[PDB]
Design a protein around this ligand. Structure first.
Ligand SMILES: [Cl-]
Ligand SMILES: [Zn+2]
Ligand SMILES: [Zn+2]
Ligand SMILES: [Zn+2]
Ligand SMILES: [Zn+2]
Ligand SMILES: [Zn+2]
Ligand SMILES: [Zn+2]
Ligand SMILES: [Zn+2]
Ligand SMILES: [Zn+2]
Lengths: 54, 52
DNA sequence: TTTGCAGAATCGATTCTGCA
DNA sequence: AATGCAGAATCGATTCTGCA
């Protein structure tokens, strides 16, 4: 589907809905190699690298 | 009135002392419903309003 | 159509400031 | 002057979206 069971928002793809769901479940598949930081979305990890590891 | 972490200036020593918590992470405001702790009162107040 | 990059927008959480 | 409450202003870690 494309509607969130938690917050009711509708998304443009099933693909992004499933990414969006992590925000409510806690699931965070992108692990920082350098610390114990994890992120739901690639961009959060990328920012985390640029700012805490430099 | 000057902070030694960030160099910023403030209007008073009272507020400088509160400002330092943002760096030191001393968080005297404490939620009696979750392990949430804050440096400034407004943060604890916001926290109570939407969580509890 | 489904997946993905990339970076701007968002808005929760915090800091700053007007006034007492 | 020093303290303090309250909300305006700001910030930034994440979400969302133009594009491919
Ligand atoms: Cl304390
Ligand atoms: Zn949702
Ligand atoms: Zn969208
Ligand atoms: Zn890291
Ligand atoms: Zn580090
Ligand atoms: Zn400072
Ligand atoms: Zn709490
Ligand atoms: Zn929360
Ligand atoms: Zn910003």
């Amino acid at each position: 589907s494309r509607e969130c069971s938690y917050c009711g928002k509708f998304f443009r793809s099933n693909y992004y809905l499933n990414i969006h769901l992590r925000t409510h479940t806690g699931e965070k598949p992108y692990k920082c190699e350098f610390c114990e930081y994890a992120a739901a979305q690639k961009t959060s990890l990328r920012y985390h690298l640029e700012r805490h590891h430099k």
